[PDB]
Each structure stands twice: as C-alpha cells, then as structure tokens.
Design a protein around this ligand. Structure first.
Ligand SMILES: CCc1oc2cc(S(=O)(=O)Nc3ccc(S(=O)(=O)Nc4nccs4)cc3)ccc2c1C(=O)c1cc(Br)c(O)c(Br)c1
Length: 286
C-alpha cells in the first residue's frame, strides 16, 4: 500500500509541516468579491474565510443572495458537498433556506456549540419535540422528530416545513460530538464509523441534493470529512487504488473553497483516516 509507506516516511522524517506548506503554496486563489461587499460583513464569521465567487451557493432571494457556503464538486468520484460556516444568530434562517433550496437530505456538524468556553455557532435546531423553531425571515418551520444519542455522535431526525407551500421534508442531522477541543482524535476509528453512518443514511447519494457540512469556519474538520470520503470512494472505483494521491485530491477540492485542512495535524489525521479505512475494507467480512 503505497500510501501507508509515504505516511511512515513523512512521520519518520517529521516533515508534515513541510508537506502542508507545499499544499498551501500550490493552492488555487480565485476572486471572492461578493463575500467582501460591506453589506455582507455580518454574514461572515471569519475575516479570512470567504467563498470563491465561482463556487458559492446562492440563496434564491432577490434581496441579498449571499451565504458563506461553497459547492465542492468531485467529478470523478461523483460526490458533491456544500461546505459552510457554523451559522451565526443572524444567518440561521439563511442556513435552512439553503438546505431547502439545495434539496439536501443531511446536515453534518463536526463541532460542539461551545468549545474552549466560547460559542462556535448558533443553536440552530430545536432541543425538544414540543418546542419547534420558526424562521420568520425565510418562512420555514423546523421540528425535532427524534434524537438518538450515541457515544461519539448524535443523530437527529428533523422536519423542515416550507410555510409558503406547506411542503415538508425530512432532514437528518449528523452531529459528531467528540472532536477534541485541541488537536485531532488519536484514532480515526470513531470518525470513520461516523462517516459510514452518514453514507448508509443516503445523505451522500446522488438522488439527493448535496450534503451540508460545517464546523466553525467550514474548512478544517469539514475538509477532513470530505477528503476522506472522496479518497475512499476513488480507491473503490479505480483499477489501481494506490494511484489515489490525497495531496492531489486535496488540491482539487481547494479549487472550490479555500483553506480546506487548516493544520499539519489535520493533514496527518486525514491520511490516517484514509489508510485505516482502506485497511478495514481489505479485511471486510460478509
Ligand atoms: C472503512 C470505514 C471504517 O474504517 C474503520 C477503521 C476502524 S480502525 O480505526 O479501528 N482500524 C482498523 C480496525 C479494524 C481492522 S480489521 O483488521 O479488523 N478489518 C475488518 N474487521 C471487520 C471488518 S473489516 C482494520 C483497521 C474502525 C472502524 C472503521 C470503519 C467503520 O466503522 C465502518 C466500516 C464499514 Br465498511 C461500514 O459499513 C461501517 Br457502517 C462502518
């Protein structure tokens, strides 16, 4: 397995930061003019994380169509993802409008609402069945249907209702709750399990709109999720799985949203996830 030995090489040489800087300097740079318009400043959580104009998700409202969200299209893998920031108190309605308009079936959340004593995103889903949320600005209603709390993640069934047309849709919320406040998980086992539970739900499948994936900024943990998913799918599709180059896949995804994978530790973790996921498939039973 050519990837595992590249991993040992980099580890032995302690050159993860070196590899990561090469990726940073090779990464695409495209205009992000809409994101920097002054009227949009309170729609962005971070000054330096903007969607490229060419891949940004547009809301269907003539008013202001801006949301900090990007479409990542992986042609060969036939996967699409929407990566977005954790919603702000003033953008929770826009977030659910995007979910509605894009026909998404799943929302993947990779952070806790509070980490390190600070708020990382708004509480944007209801916490009790009988206390639904209404987003008056985008005319949507959100009801908690069920909630299944597991050791490393929680899954919620939500009902989204378009109050204007009275159409309703079932949305699955996949909430990974155990990413550490600092650094990355020591083992990728629970993260890979989570990813494949999202897969089995149908939320990544082509009959639905793109999954919505977010963390704090929508580039770091979120990038690790998409990169691992796409790499593992490509290894199943190609005649030669060892031809999959995680660095090249990462650079292709960075054509669609800047900053994916924020630290050298996240880069190493992404390799480790792909390697261990591959090895699990090679020993798979049935
Ligand atoms: C490929 C995705 C996946 O990758 C994983 C890696 C681990 S791991 O971190 O503990 N590493 C690991 C663990 C075990 C093995 S193994 O040698 O025991 N191979 C297999 N045993 C049963 C089936 S396959 C090889 C590597 C654990 C769990 C998974 C995992 C799953 O949790 C998982 C896999 C599939 Br396929 C699946 O349909 C679902 Br649902 C979950």
């Amino acid at each position: 397995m050519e990837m595992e030995k590249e991993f040992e090489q980099i580890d032995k040489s302690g050159s993860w930061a070196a590899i990561y800087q090469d990726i940073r300097h090779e990464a695409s740079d495209f205009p992000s003019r809409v994101a920097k318009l002054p009227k949009n400043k309170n729609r962005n959580r971070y000054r330096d994380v903007s969607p490229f104009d060419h891949s940004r998700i547009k809301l269907h409202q003539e008013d202001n169509d801006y949301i900090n969200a990007s479409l990542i299209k992986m042609e060969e893998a036939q996967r699409s993802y929407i990566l977005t920031q954790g919603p702000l108190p003033n953008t929770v309605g826009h977030f659910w409008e995007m979910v509605w308009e894009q026909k998404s079936r799943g929302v993947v959340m990779l952070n806790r609402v509070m980490e390190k004593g600070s708020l990382k995103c708004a509480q944007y889903w209801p916490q009790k069945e009988e206390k639904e949320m209404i987003f008056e600005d985008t005319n949507l209603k959100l009801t908690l249907i069920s909630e299944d709390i597991k050791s490393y993640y929680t899954v919620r069934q939500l009902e989204l209702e378009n109050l204007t047309t009275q159409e309703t849709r079932e949305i699955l919320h996949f909430h990974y709750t155990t990413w550490p406040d600092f650094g990355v998980p020591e083992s990728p086992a629970s993260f890979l399990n989570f990813l494949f539970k999202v897969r089995e739900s149908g939320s990544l499948s082509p009959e639905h709109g793109p999954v919505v994936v977010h963390c704090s900024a929508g580039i770091g943990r979120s990038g690790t999720f998409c990169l691992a998913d796409t790499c593992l799918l490509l290894m199943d599709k190609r005649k030669d799985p060892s031809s999959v180059d995680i660095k090249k896949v990462l650079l292709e995804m960075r054509k669609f949203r800047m900053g994916l994978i924020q630290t050298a530790d996240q880069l190493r973790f992404s390799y480790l996830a792909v390697i261990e996921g591959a090895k699990f498939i090679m020993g798979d039973s049935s």
